[PDB]
Ligand binder design. Sequence first.
Ligand code: NA
Length: 82
Amino acid sequence: SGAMDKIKYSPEAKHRTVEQHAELDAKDSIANTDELPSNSTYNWKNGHKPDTSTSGEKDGIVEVHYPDGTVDDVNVKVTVTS
Ligand code: NA
C-alpha cells in the first residue's frame, strides 16, 4: 500500500482580487504551489471558472492534477473590482 498524491499533498486556496475582464490562470489561485510537486498541473474545473466580466465576489474550483494521476479540487474566491 501507499499514499496517493492527493492524500499526501494539501493545496490551499489563495484569495485573489482582480479588475473586471482580467484573465485568471488557475494556478494563481493556489496559495502553496511550492508545497505541491512542481510537475502538478492546474486548471479550472469545468463550469467553475470565476467570471471576471462582471465585478463582485466570485467563486471557482481549481483542479490540482498530481503526477500519479490523482486530482484535488480546491474551492477558491475571486474578488472582481470595477
Ligand atoms: Na489533498
